[PDB]
Design a protein around this ligand. Structure first.
Ligand SMILES: C=C1Oc2cc(OC)cc(C(=O)O[C@H]3COC(=O)C[C@H]([NH3+])c4cc(O)c(c(Cl)c4)O[C@@H]4c5ccc3cc5C3=CC=C[C@@]34O[C@@H]3OC(C)(C)[C@@H](N(C)C)[C@@H](O)[C@H]3O)c2NC1=O
Length: 110
């Protein structure tokens, strides 16, 4: 598995933007990055922050991604699951695409 880390990862805030950076990947591929949050049963991701970033010549990447304490969850397949709120709940950003999974960083608004 390649590497994937974010600057901060706790006591975050809505609108707060962190500088993420992935490595070990390979130039010639694009991965989707977005915040998500499971719900003791299914999985709801953010359909708003769904951007696709490609790696560089050395298969490395690094950019600024904003976050949102609260956000309506919704499986990436195409179905509404409900609303989510990290104000007092648990959340975790995930990256990767259909072929190469990057990593999963847990966040914590507070
Ligand atoms: C147009 C988009 O619209 C949405 C809507 C949404 O609902 C809120 C959530 C996400 C999102 O960001 O989902 C994220 C949600 O993040 C996670 O799910 C984190 C989890 N750690 C994870 C889940 C997962 O399925 C996966 C990986 Cl690498 C990681 O594989 C690939 C993967 C990684 C991340 C995501 C989804 C997948 C796919 C689903 C099935 C296989 C995957 O492979 C993905 O399968 C599809 C079918 C999703 C595909 N499709 C053409 C987009 C493309 O994204 C492909 O990389 C997006 N992204 C979009 O591109």
């Amino acid at each position: 598995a390649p590497a994937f880390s974010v600057s901060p990862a706790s006591g975050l805030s809505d609108g707060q933007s962190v500088s993420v950076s992935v490595s070990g990947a390979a130039a010639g591929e694009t991965y989707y990055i977005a915040q998500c949050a499971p719900v003791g049963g299914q999985d709801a991701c953010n359909p708003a922050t769904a951007t696709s970033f490609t790696t560089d010549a050395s298969g490395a990447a690094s950019f600024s991604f904003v976050v949102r304490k609260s956000y309506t969850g919704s499986t990436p397949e195409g179905t509404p699951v409900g609303s989510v709120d990290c104000a007092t709940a648990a959340c975790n950003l995930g990256a990767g695409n259909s072929g190469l999974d990057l990593g999963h960083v847990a966040l914590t608004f507070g």
